[PDB]
Amino acid sequence: MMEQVCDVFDIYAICACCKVESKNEGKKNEVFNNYTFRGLGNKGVLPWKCISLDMKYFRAVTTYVNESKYEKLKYKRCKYLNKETKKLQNVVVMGRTNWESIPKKFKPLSNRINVILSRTLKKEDFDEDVYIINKVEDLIVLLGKLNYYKCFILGGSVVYQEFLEKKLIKKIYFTRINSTYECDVFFPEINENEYQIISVSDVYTSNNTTLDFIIYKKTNNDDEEEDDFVYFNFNKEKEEKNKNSIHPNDFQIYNSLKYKYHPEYQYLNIIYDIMMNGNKQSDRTGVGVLSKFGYIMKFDLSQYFPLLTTKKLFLRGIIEELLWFIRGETNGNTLLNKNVRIWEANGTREFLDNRKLFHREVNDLGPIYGFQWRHFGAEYTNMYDNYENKGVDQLKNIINLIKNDPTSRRILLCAWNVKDLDQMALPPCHILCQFYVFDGKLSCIMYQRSCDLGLGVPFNIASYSIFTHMIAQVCNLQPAQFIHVLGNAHVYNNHIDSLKIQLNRIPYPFPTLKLNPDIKNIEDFTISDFTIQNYVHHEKISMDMAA
Amino acid sequence: MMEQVCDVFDIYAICACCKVESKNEGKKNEVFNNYTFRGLGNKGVLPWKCISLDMKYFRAVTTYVNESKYEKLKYKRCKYLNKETKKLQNVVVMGRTNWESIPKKFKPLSNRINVILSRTLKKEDFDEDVYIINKVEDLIVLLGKLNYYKCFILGGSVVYQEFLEKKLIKKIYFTRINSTYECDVFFPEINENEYQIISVSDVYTSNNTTLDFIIYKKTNNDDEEEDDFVYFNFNKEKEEKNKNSIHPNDFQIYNSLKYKYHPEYQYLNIIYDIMMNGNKQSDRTGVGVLSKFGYIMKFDLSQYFPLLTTKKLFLRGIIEELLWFIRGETNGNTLLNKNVRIWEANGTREFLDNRKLFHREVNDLGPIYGFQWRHFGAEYTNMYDNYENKGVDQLKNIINLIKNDPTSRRILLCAWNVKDLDQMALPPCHILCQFYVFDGKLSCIMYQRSCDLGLGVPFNIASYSIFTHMIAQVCNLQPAQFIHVLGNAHVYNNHIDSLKIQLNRIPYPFPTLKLNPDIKNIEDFTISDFTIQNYVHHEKISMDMAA
Ligand SMILES: NC(=O)c1ccc[n+]([C@@H]2O[C@H](COP(=O)([O-])OP(=O)(O)OC[C@H]3O[C@@H](n4cnc5c(N)ncnc54)[C@H](OP(=O)(O)O)[C@@H]3O)[C@@H](O)[C@H]2O)c1
Ligand SMILES: NC(=O)c1ccc[n+]([C@@H]2O[C@H](COP(=O)([O-])OP(=O)(O)OC[C@H]3O[C@@H](n4cnc5c(N)ncnc54)[C@H](OP(=O)(O)O)[C@@H]3O)[C@@H](O)[C@H]2O)c1
Ligand SMILES: CCc1nc(N)nc(N)c1OCCCOc1ccc(-c2c(N)nc(N)nc2CC)cc1
Ligand SMILES: CCc1nc(N)nc(N)c1OCCCOc1ccc(-c2c(N)nc(N)nc2CC)cc1
Ligand SMILES: O=c1ccn([C@H]2C[C@H](O)[C@@H](COP(=O)(O)O)O2)c(=O)[nH]1
Ligand SMILES: O=c1ccn([C@H]2C[C@H](O)[C@@H](COP(=O)(O)O)O2)c(=O)[nH]1
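Structure tokens for the assembled complex are given below, as produced in the milestone run.
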């Protein structure tokens, strides 16, 4: 161990990678991994038309200096080589093709030191205060003579390839662009043993793509108020109750992360919380849970579609269910004949009998969500009866409100009808949603009384997110936030090992949802009006791992 | 200027102060201020029995050392003095009387260098490893000689007084014990110009009293990861929604605080978030609001009763309301005969006509909370009707589920009867409340669709905290958490001046709720079964200044 080269000289790789078109060997049969995001360039330019937010990220990472921490680094640098050499700048390193593709109005890059890798050009051509090298070591030298903050390797592929071959990068600042384009040059396969992810940012939309910012790190083979903090923590616990449940190392990869800003962590951190701090309880099913009470999650629907990526999820079933609710239906068979088996178990002879609904036809689920959304307060008879004009059509009511009185605080869709609870195959989990409108934008809160975190909550997030889009569109509004409130939040005992596996997986930038813009009424949507674009995801998990 | 002594040598005071018996007057109109907490001792001993949480705090602060921080402290002290440069310990200083009040088995205070101020006793009178000094100057000299972390002045009042009078105290660690005792010695009057509060802790219960810990400050007359933080922060805007009608100094006291752990800040932080980032909107009245969507507050009912202290609130009205709900009443005249006017505006002829309830008698509020709690589904006729065994008695049901199925996820009381909204004098604000039972403890979530932060939310927190206590007591449980979910959370425009004021007030430790333990059925409570103890509060505010 010689104190490392790129740790002394602060040498970093900053890149942007899209998905690569290897059409047409399937689409539904795809095994995703980190290597998915790979495409650097195509025929002398970037694969994409623009991408402004990654441009603005690049700008701030490569032009940010901290004057204070510099002395700590200047003292560190001169000590190693034995040497001595207005405002402070960063050193950006690039190749020739890379350098000559940028416009002359934007050359050289403002407030940086612009080194170039080329076995061709000499200094005479650039009369400017810009440097040239010609070998792998010539940079190491040129940094020693210069006063800088950090060193950023800008590519392209060959430049990147050989900076990682000779192990001269400590950290990789990596934008994942969640879309496909034609590419002929690729970022290299990042080796597993060498580099590991340490931070993952929030998810964003810039110019019709989602994207996220991750960071890889290299791996081995005044002060009174800081005391005031320790004082306020005098009574804090020295160990948690679930230590007959959890080993130190179950969450190695989850805990190895420094910044977890991906909105999926809002879901994973709740599961972590329950597994660590939750309460051992029985329940109706007999399986037993770890439970806690009261959480809030928020998803920014303007930036992404919150479909979980740490496991595989399918949407057709939940969209069929949503459209069946909107119709006012309670007929389990309509769903069964489309091969959506969400309500199957809830409609059997055995099940209906355990509910003492002895006189109810198989798959007649009684006055559940659909019925309450369209006919609240009407007498339920059977699934085939004519209910047209009977009871309060909440759905129509909330839509008229959202259009005609947006500032109303009464825009609520409720399924918890106390009168009818006992006639329902089972009482509703999603008690209600409340809508909110400001500046042409719709947000939705959904209160959920009971939440199976391993199995149900992933579908529930997606479903009310879709529903929020549907409502917004048919009201001439843009979707804003979906806010999910959790009552009894539980992890079922038979889900533990599966969640230990899931929680150690690193989220992918989220997909998006496209709706047919022609649909102007809630009643008019059909299954093919829905498209999930750019769904990148880990492999499926069977939530109890044997059946 | 040659720096302050207290700063070189790190001299802090630490005390615990209770409230003092000033009897034979009648505590119906009491003024509270910082000087409310001033009682130090009685008859040469502590005014209270134990208060072990304060003792644990006192020990933790006075014995806490940071080795890594000393090397700098050493440098500074030796710089100030022209000098060169077992385990590290703090110095503790006490008066003679204070030293003699300490039990033998605890003398000298463990892991601390002990120092005594005394003229009557000399070194030869002490068996113990202690320093005797006869003048304050001599501590300064001694501190220059010793290796130590920090220096804490422990009392009594005479020591405290002269340290403050000679201006040698740089922070005061102050425990406010929220109960009244007989005292003969008092901590000195702290001057607002010389010291101000900079931190405020959580509220707790120890030995049948609430307490908290505040910090006064002296006023005048891998470091790698921190760049990654700035990089993830690239996309953070310059300004806020309204950043000129909100002046810098509107919240100067509020923003002057480093640690705001007092649970009353869950409420004041919400107002603040709405005042700075809220949305400008109209509402059903002409007044207008700043609004946001979706918050959660959590109050630990085992540690305190969260009655807002930053202004004056009374509970007689809201307890009657609650008792009126529980009885299933919809008759406005009942609350007016007890001089409670909460529902008066909503029961008037003009108000009822404007709701199109022309055939409704004045103060017949229709099928509101009470009716829904005891008769969900029944046909409302008039407020005088007999509704026995009509509808679903939700209240008996949830009491039954708490007692016999505590692990149920269906323990929910719903006021939002969609069928009835139009017949109610006005739709409900408190939509639902869901209960949770674990280890003999009851928690409660209330979902509020519409939240008047200036005027409604403070009482609502109280109502539902009281309600949680009542339900827990009749079910043989102990209250745990009240969890409050806010939907449309709004600050009215006419409340802005008075909330700018309220938010610069610093909270006092919360009071406690006492229910008569003999009450065993939810229907048996009466006004006199409720006592609020030790309510310490700032002056009453009028939320609008047009009435
Ligand atoms: N996201 C990104 O990373 C990014 C950014 C901009 C553009 N691109 C795209 O990707 C391409 C750039 O990547 P690339 O790898 O193909 O080209 P490049 O890295 O920009 O430049 C390669 C050229 O630089 C010279 N060179 C390479 N390694 C060297 C070394 N160790 N010492 C001295 N000279 C060296 C070589 O010959 P010469 O001496 O003859 O030049 C070589 O032809 C562009 O065509 C563009 O479309 C990608
Ligand atoms: N609740 C709390 O946080 C707290 C904290 C501290 C104390 N207390 C209570 O308050 C009681 C004591 O308070 P107190 O004010 O009566 O007595 P004190 O301040 O503990 O001690 C005063 C005595 O110390 C000596 N002394 C003080 N200043 C001196 C100076 N500059 N130079 C030389 N000698 C000095 C004198 O001793 P000689 O008479 O020997 O000359 C004097 O009689 C204790 O019994 C304790 O229970 C409570
Ligand atoms: C910005 C994308 C980018 N993003 C990340 N996370 N890492 C990188 N290394 C990277 O860049 C590749 C190396 C740099 O390549 C270029 C060429 C041209 C330009 C240009 C451009 N195409 N058009 C304009 N107007 N200005 C500029 C200079 C402002 C920007 C970056
Ligand atoms: C603890 C109250 C207290 N609380 C705060 N925030 N600051 C103080 N200065 C303070 O006072 C300590 C100095 C007061 O002097 C005494 C006498 C007796 C005792 C004693 C006692 N009465 N009983 C036990 N068991 N132990 C101890 C010593 C551990 C402690 C301190
Ligand atoms: O959309 C749903 C429907 C059901 N559940 C789960 C929660 C409970 O684990 C179970 C229903 O049981 P009760 O809460 O009704 O006991 O199904 C969900 O998480 N989401
Ligand atoms: O217990 C209550 C009762 C009413 N409100 C407030 C919220 C609204 O400002 C107003 C009722 O108006 P709508 O939301 O129904 O418009 O009263 C409360 O905050 N708490």
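Residues 456-474 of chain B form the longest helix (19 residues). The radius of gyration of chain B is 28 Å. Further analysis is deferred to the final report.
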